[PDB]
Enzyme design. Structure first.
Site, PDB file in Angstrom:
ATOM      1  N   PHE A   1      -9.574   3.998  26.490  1.00 50.88           N
ATOM      2  CA  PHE A   1      -9.485   4.798  25.652  1.00 50.88           C
ATOM      3  C   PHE A   1      -8.773   4.424  24.066  1.00 50.88           C
ATOM      4  CE2 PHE A   1      -7.525   8.083  26.673  1.00 50.88           C
ATOM      5  CZ  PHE A   1      -6.353   8.932  26.722  1.00 50.88           C
TER       6      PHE A   1
ATOM      7  N   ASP B   1     -18.917  16.000  30.788  1.00 47.53           N
ATOM      8  CA  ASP B   1     -18.357  15.157  31.602  1.00 47.53           C
ATOM      9  C   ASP B   1     -16.861  15.459  32.296  1.00 47.53           C
ATOM     10  OD1 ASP B   1     -17.072  12.639  32.518  1.00 47.53           O
ATOM     11  OD2 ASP B   1     -16.127  11.518  30.309  1.00 47.53           O
TER      12      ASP B   1
ATOM     13  N   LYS C   1      -3.442  11.284  20.194  1.00 45.69           N
ATOM     14  CA  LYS C   1      -4.660  10.351  20.830  1.00 45.69           C
ATOM     15  C   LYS C   1      -5.110   9.223  20.189  1.00 45.69           C
ATOM     16  CE  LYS C   1      -8.797  10.648  22.932  1.00 45.69           C
ATOM     17  NZ  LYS C   1      -9.810  10.734  23.638  1.00 45.69           N
TER      18      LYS C   1
HETATM   19  C1  LIG Z   1      -1.975   8.011  32.272  1.00 46.14           C
HETATM   20  O1  LIG Z   1      -1.398   8.217  33.164  1.00 46.14           O
HETATM   21  C2  LIG Z   1      -1.313   9.683  33.533  1.00 46.14           C
HETATM   22  C3  LIG Z   1      -0.693  10.935  32.101  1.00 46.14           C
HETATM   23  O2  LIG Z   1      -2.406  10.436  31.910  1.00 46.14           O
HETATM   24  C4  LIG Z   1      -2.699  12.051  30.540  1.00 46.14           C
HETATM   25  C5  LIG Z   1      -1.251  12.008  29.216  1.00 46.14           C
HETATM   26  C6  LIG Z   1      -1.827  13.080  28.570  1.00 46.14           C
HETATM   27  C7  LIG Z   1      -2.888  13.324  28.718  1.00 46.14           C
HETATM   28  C8  LIG Z   1      -4.122  13.032  29.120  1.00 46.14           C
HETATM   29  C9  LIG Z   1      -4.122  12.147  30.360  1.00 46.14           C
HETATM   30  O3  LIG Z   1      -4.837  11.703  30.931  1.00 46.14           O
HETATM   31  C10 LIG Z   1      -6.331  12.061  30.949  1.00 46.14           C
HETATM   32  C11 LIG Z   1      -6.771  11.712  29.817  1.00 46.14           C
HETATM   33  O4  LIG Z   1      -6.492  11.046  29.057  1.00 46.14           O
HETATM   34  N1  LIG Z   1      -7.593  12.129  28.724  1.00 46.14           N
HETATM   35  C12 LIG Z   1      -8.269  13.711  29.450  1.00 46.14           C
HETATM   36  C13 LIG Z   1      -7.930  12.040  27.232  1.00 46.14           C
HETATM   37  C14 LIG Z   1      -6.992  12.119  25.702  1.00 46.14           C
HETATM   38  C15 LIG Z   1      -6.792  13.862  26.704  1.00 46.14           C
HETATM   39  N2  LIG Z   1      -5.112  14.306  25.744  1.00 46.14           N
HETATM   40  C16 LIG Z   1      -5.831  13.664  24.184  1.00 46.14           C
HETATM   41  C17 LIG Z   1      -5.788  15.646  25.279  1.00 46.14           C
HETATM   42  C18 LIG Z   1      -4.468  16.760  25.253  1.00 46.14           C
HETATM   43  C19 LIG Z   1      -3.554  17.407  24.793  1.00 46.14           C
HETATM   44  N3  LIG Z   1      -2.540  17.766  24.702  1.00 46.14           N
HETATM   45  C20 LIG Z   1      -2.378  17.740  25.070  1.00 46.14           C
HETATM   46  N4  LIG Z   1      -1.073  17.139  25.290  1.00 46.14           N
HETATM   47  C21 LIG Z   1      -0.585  16.641  26.694  1.00 46.14           C
HETATM   48  N5  LIG Z   1      -0.994  15.740  27.487  1.00 46.14           N
HETATM   49  C22 LIG Z   1      -2.570  15.490  26.783  1.00 46.14           C
HETATM   50  C23 LIG Z   1      -2.889  16.469  26.045  1.00 46.14           C
HETATM   51  N6  LIG Z   1      -3.331  14.430  27.616  1.00 46.14           N
END
Ligand SMILES: COCCOc1ccc2cc1OCC(=O)N(C)CCCN(C)Cc1c[nH]c3ncnc(c13)N2
Length: 351
Positions: free
Chosen positions: A34, A150, A53
């Site tokens: 995405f 999902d 994001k």
């Molecule tokens: C790339 O390989 C390992 C790292 O993968 C990710 C790193 C950080 C993420 C999520 C990761 O994987 C899953 C993914 O991209 N989704 C589920 C979509 C995005 C969801 N976020 C935007 C939700 C979110 C809200 N506050 C956050 N604070 C920290 N990290 C987050 C989020 N998401």
């Protein structure tokens, strides 16, 4: 400086760059199909920590992000106090064709944490607390005419994934144990209200329920099946249905959970999967042999015999009921004796 995109439409992101005259990039958190997730400081809100994001500059992803934004607006209207464990947006903007959505900064997702622990599973008390929170979050969405569609380990995130490193009691290796098992549910772009169009196929394959495979329609019970599958994965550290194809997936379901109900077989238009009222499949093929070797009855996967394990497996079997009408609802799930094991702090949401 110019705004640059790579060959897949991803924004080229640089530490020190600002977006909307407001968000300063301070780290990269991850990338998927995405777009990207980046850590920022919000200079219009006292240098608060944000996860942004950033969606690829590709029409279909742009349209999907606009849909996610519109879902997220509706969820916040229904939970203005932000009490039901969902990751709600704090801002959104279109940055030169890249949709950007700003969220609270969280810890690692539950899949990433599992992977970084070399797939060693979560301890039962962690599984139980995570289960309780999931049932709580989704119960609220379900009562407000929404289905996520999902759910999977990657869109469930720890509030803080700091961990202690312990020597494994019974294995020649170290283990990571999360200090705080508070979690939040994210990624609402596929979430669908009762009145809206329901696509034939939903969910990521490993988390997808039989009514969807058999094209019988779906609703909120789709999410409960996915939760069943998630809780197994947290408990064992491996996927319940490691499958790539519908016929195989069905065979796995029969081997793990028992026969598909005859009433579901009679109703499905996907009669290609059946012959003489039973699943039809090639036992001698690569997939056939894989399933015969590897897929055993559900109860066989219990690690211990004690009461709390037996209760977890009773709940999981109820979440994995073939007939979605018979499947346990989350409201009933919250009444299950498995949850008698929660500490008071866990039960009253003071974690
Ligand atoms: C790339 O390989 C390992 C790292 O993968 C990710 C790193 C950080 C993420 C999520 C990761 O994987 C899953 C993914 O991209 N989704 C589920 C979509 C995005 C969801 N976020 C935007 C939700 C979110 C809200 N506050 C956050 N604070 C920290 N990290 C987050 C989020 N998401």
């Amino acid at each position: 400086r110019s705004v640059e995109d790579d060959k897949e439409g991803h924004l080229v992101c640089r530490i020190g760059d600002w977006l909307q005259e407001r968000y300063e990039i301070v780290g990269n958190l991850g990338e998927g199909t995405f777009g990207k997730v980046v850590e920022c400081l919000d200079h219009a809100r006292g240098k608060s920590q944000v996860a942004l994001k950033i969606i690829r500059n590709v029409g279909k992803y742009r349209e999907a992000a606009r849909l996610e934004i519109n879902v997220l607006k509706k969820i916040k209207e229904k939970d203005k106090e932000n009490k039901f464990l969902c990751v709600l947006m704090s801002d959104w903007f279109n940055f030169h064709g890249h949709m950007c959505i700003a969220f609270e900064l969280l810890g690692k997702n539950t899949f990433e944490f599992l992977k970084e622990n070399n797939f060693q599973p979560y301890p039962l008390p962690h599984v139980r607390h995570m289960a309780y929170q999931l049932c709580h979050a989704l119960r609220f969405l379900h009562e407000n005419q929404l289905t996520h569609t999902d759910l999977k380990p990657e869109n469930i995130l720890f509030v803080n994934s700091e961990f202690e490193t312990l020597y494994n009691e019974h294995k020649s290796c170290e283990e990571k144990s999360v200090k705080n098992t508070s979690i939040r549910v994210a990624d609402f772009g596929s979430a669908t209200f009762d009145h809206e169009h329901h696509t034939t196929i939903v969910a990521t394959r490993h988390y997808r329920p039989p009514e969807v495979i058999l094209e019988l329609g779906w609703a909120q019970p789709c999410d409960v099946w996915s939760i069943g599958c998630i809780l197994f994965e947290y408990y064992r550290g491996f996927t319940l249905f490691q499958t790539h194809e519908n016929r195989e997936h069905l065979v796995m379901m029969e081997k793990i959970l028992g026969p598909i109900p005859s009433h579901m077989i009679h109703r499905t238009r996907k009669q290609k999967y059946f012959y003489k009222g039973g699943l039809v499949w090639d036992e001698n093929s690569s997939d056939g042999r894989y399933v015969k070797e590897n897929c055993k009855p559900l109860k066989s996967y219990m690690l211990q015999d004690s009461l709390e394990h037996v209760q977890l497996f009773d709940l999981m079997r109820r979440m994995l009921e073939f007939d979605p009408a018979q499947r346990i609802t989350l409201a009933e799930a919250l009444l299950h004796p498995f949850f008698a094991g929660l500490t008071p702090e866990e039960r009253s949401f003071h974690t």
